[PDB]
Amino acid sequence: PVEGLIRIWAHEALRLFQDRLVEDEERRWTDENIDTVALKHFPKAMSRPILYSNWLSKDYIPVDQEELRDYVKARLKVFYEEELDVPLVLFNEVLDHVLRIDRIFRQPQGHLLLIGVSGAGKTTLSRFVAWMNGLSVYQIKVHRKYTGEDFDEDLRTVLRRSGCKNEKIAFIMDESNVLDSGFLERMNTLLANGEVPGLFEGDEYATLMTQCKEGAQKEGLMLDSHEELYKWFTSQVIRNLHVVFTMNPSSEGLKDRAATSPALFNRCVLNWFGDWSTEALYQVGKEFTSKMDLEKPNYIVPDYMPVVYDKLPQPPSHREAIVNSCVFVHQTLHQANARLAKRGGRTMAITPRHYLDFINHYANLFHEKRSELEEQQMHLNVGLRKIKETVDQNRSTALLKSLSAERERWEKTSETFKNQMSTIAGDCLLSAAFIAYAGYFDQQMRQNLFTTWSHHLQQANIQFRTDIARTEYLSNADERLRWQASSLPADDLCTENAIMLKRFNRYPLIIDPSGQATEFIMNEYKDRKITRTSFLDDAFRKNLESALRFGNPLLVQDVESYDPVLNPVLNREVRRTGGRVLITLGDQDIDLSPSFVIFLSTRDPTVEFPPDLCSRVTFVNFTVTRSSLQSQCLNEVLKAERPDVDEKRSDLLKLQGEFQLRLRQLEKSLLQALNEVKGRILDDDTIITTLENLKREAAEVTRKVEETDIVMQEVETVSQQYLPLSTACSSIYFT
Amino acid sequence: PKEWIPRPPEKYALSGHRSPVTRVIFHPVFSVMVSASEDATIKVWDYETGDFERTLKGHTDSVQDISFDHSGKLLASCSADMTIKLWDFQGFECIRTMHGHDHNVSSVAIMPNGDHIVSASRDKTIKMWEVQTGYCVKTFTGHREWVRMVRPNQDGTLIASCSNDQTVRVWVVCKAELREHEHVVECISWAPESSYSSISEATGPFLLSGSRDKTIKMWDVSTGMCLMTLVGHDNWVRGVLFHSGGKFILSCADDKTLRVWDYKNKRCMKTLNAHEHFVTSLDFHKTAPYVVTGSVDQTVKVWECR
Amino acid sequence: PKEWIPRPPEKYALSGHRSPVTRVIFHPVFSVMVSASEDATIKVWDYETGDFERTLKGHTDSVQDISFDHSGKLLASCSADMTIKLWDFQGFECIRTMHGHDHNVSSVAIMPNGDHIVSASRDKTIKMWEVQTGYCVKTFTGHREWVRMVRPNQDGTLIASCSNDQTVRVWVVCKAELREHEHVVECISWAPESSYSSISEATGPFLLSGSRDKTIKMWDVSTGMCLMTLVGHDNWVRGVLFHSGGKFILSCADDKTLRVWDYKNKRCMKTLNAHEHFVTSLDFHKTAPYVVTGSVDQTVKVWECR
Ligand SMILES: Nc1ncnc2c1ncn2[C@@H]1O[C@H](COP(=O)(O)OP(=O)(O)O)[C@@H](O)[C@H]1O
């Protein structure tokens, strides 16, 4: 009908004069003026999601979003089974992007330019769309000492594979290899004409003519002249080959590329792939945490809504508020790096993979902490049920009053379990936000970020507990003592850093000026036979597979000489060949141990990083702060002046350590030993000796009080004399 | 095919447990059964092969009973920690947890249409819930004591309940009170359509009542007349259910024995060496020739039917 | 007597699988069907009664394909755990297991003579094994990548196969390559001898090939000339088979529809809304008026022919 012609008219309008716009105001302008001109020239014509596809029929038909989402989800499951198996969530605009790359791959010479923020999936989405369209994907690989001759060899081989072999090929690449001066000319010619002269000279010309002979014979056309066969080769390249370039949204880069490659902006099709809008953030947060039990029936709405995502439900639900906060904690990083740019600091790229790791850490921490808390409450229940049995049934009264304090502590911990279920979600939210977003900030800005997040959550009436330290929640005493025994400085910042280096979703960088963090991370994983190398080391190529196959962790320094060959490792583009896991490196394919992690470290703390590493690696800063410096400032001066007092302080602190550990072990042994017997406690007499032998070993708490008194009374010799010196000297260091 | 009766030996004897059993059921579609326990655990074994698949954790106290939706995706469980947990059997993780019960929950039952769930607890109240949201839509009361078990009819309109008050109460979402029992009523079971013709010549709707008085009594739902009474159990009855064809009744009691009752002839037909310790509960597969019994003996034996 | 065609509603709708379905096939002799699933399992059902018969578990990874000897005793299966398992369909036990494929094996096929078995796998090679010993006797090569499926002709002298290279290859125990598909080729079907007359009206041997283009094509094997192209599927093709008499072609595609085509007129006639999701495989009973379709949706449907 007429209306269908209007639909295709408007679809072409919105896919030619809206795909390359930058700001949302321009898009609103285009859509509204399309509506007005449609009203003017032709008095459900304009259903909001104008959409067209050929995957619900044999030809180009309108489609609806829901069944398209179902189809692409099933086909993406098949894609997982076939190629990569990287869990990808489906939000709204990804469908639009998928249909757009499909449309351009349908067109001959369907070259694409995708202006998108690094980490936004502009490569893997293109691979996914290319896969179902019968389009094999060829990606360039960059190694050390990469020259133009290697790239020319790749171009010769693939042009043979596309011209004479007659198989459809796509070229999804980014700036990585494009940097060199000789690279740009070949693409400026290829995207323009489809043939690149002065490239096939030598015996290569003769052998590709020989191959084109059999190619033309198989196609069915007889050719026996070099020039006409070369024309057929060119026409085949026009038929089969596709090139997709992905660029970061840099104004200077765009101007330079428009200057040095007009055909790249003339022949290719433009798509401002861009960054994820707040709608996309809301959709990802909603759908990735839809399976989690974040529902609170007793949620009360505040009067004032902090609105960072529009079109919210007027009454919001608890999960809706949580995902709203998940959007807020991502816009807060934008605000923070804006402040850091305005003050004159160094800013890192803000990529959606940060948000993805934030949500993954949210789910992981939520699951783990809920499980542990329920397990300990189960222990509490069985212990109370075994003490009440003892009560129902002298040495028995002595044994019942001996466990009186433990019984009181357990009973007091029991009744607050509802409040512990209440504030699990907010605590885990703040924890995950600190894990993901606070990687590359100093102490003061980290505190500022946490304070703003706390203010936002308080404004939203989201329940969380403030009387708990950031390092205390994410780590228990045992691992903290292990870290302190692994040459980690005893301060909150390095505690957080150790939490990053153990509990992470992505492989990290270490920003260490002194190299003490290298010693700490070498001592931590020494049991797994840690080994160290560097990017500039010539044996690193040999060492990579030796680390990967046997699973021994690898430590790599000097990341300012970064080799992109680790790109599959960072993204974990693994495949399962049944009982084995296979990974690719461009040169060779090798197995992976189930347990493997690579450690990356940076020496110079002021190195600006390209967004390719920013989007695929997290950050930790081993900086120095006021109290942190004061610690070794007091230790050094005390050692220099009074060796005896320093030795006494070290011994007292150590003896506090293992004795606190002993107290914890006694509590655990009194809990578990009580539970793991079903024979009425009174009836058992072997039991009474052990369950009153361990309560009697809990009198070392008074010894612990004794050296506690000693340390807090003998510290006045130091802390009341060297405090001003330490304060002035730390101020001196920062000045 | 309406006449396969259990016979020994047990097809499989699964003792991979560290505490007694409370309930056992077959998954409606997939060939798997599940078992509840007092150790705050729900265990998933394949009865067709007898291999261990996984364990479901998350409850903190004794899991009192478990129920399945008609679809076979939504799994419900209740325990003594006041909570009713909804489990995605596909994803194997607690979709949501329920709060509001004042004291211990004995049983829950997903309604056949799979949109609501109803629960029975020690506060002498019956609560019906919205599965998708977790909001308590309504609460039925009138019972005097612990509501030991509640079961809905095949159409969801009528829900029956038993308690320590010895009165089986039924109401339409008190229609009838059945107070003549000599002792606590332990378990109930709606009669299937297959037994309608058999019951008619033996003498709706029609309902059972298993009790701690060592008797099993069949009932008329509308008028509440005790249609008959099976006799012969030596201890407290814990589970009563009909055969798939409605011709037999499979029952268990604490007499360490599983009995098969021909209610047409009003007599016990067959008795099995159920378990060394008391028989907790039973269940009869709708179609396949398998039946299962899990006992307070830390074992979940599967009888084959001939 | 060559014109019974499937029509709705289905004779049976069996939902026992815990996972999607990869193949469905009828036994040559007994009135039973057999299907392989993603859960590393095979299921044997009775299509006449629609009742579950058994499960030949033993595989570790997803069983993708299954094939029978004519005698009905030896059953072949292949799965992604690198292996090919030969089973006694009388004793229901793995007679033997063969290894050697470097990656996932997609398809196997017992030759009609029952002396050897051919297998195709992700490593772009085809291997021919002894049925009674399990020794790799032959290894055809030359595919660039995954051999999606392999089939021998009626006498077994000639073997055809389809891969991701869009090049349906045929060779004697390379004779021909068919390389004018627009996309990956999923399934093939050696045309029956009974079509030799009808195709002569429509226009050897003669070979089918369905592909991700939504295009089924019939081809001359000896000359390699593309003979015709049925189009009309709204998604990827996954299965194609001729009618018993060669008068119609039944095909399955991911359009949630099973199509019945008259290739003489070169047009669709009948369309069956098979399942709510992807249809992965089909089969035609050689004599009985029934067919089978297995879908991603975990449901196997037996379709009544009239
Ligand atoms: N929407 C998304 N959902 C999940 N993962 C994503 C998404 N976008 C990107 N990724 C991650 O990024 C990796 C590939 O990103 P890529 O397409 O190379 O983006 P870029 O080209 O900007 O680096 C994958 O390993 C994937 O895990």
Author numbering:
A (entry chain A): 2817 to 2859, 2865 to 3214, 3473 to 3814
B (entry chain C), C (entry chain B): 91 to 263, 268 to 297, 308 to 410
Verbatim from the authors:
Cytoplasmic dynein-1 (dynein here) is a conserved microtubule-based molecular motor. The lissencephaly 1 protein, LIS1, is mutated in type-1 lissencephaly and is a key regulator of cytoplasmic dynein-1. Recent work has shown that LIS1 has a conserved role in relieving dynein autoinhibition. At a functional level, Lis1 is a dimer of two β-propellers.
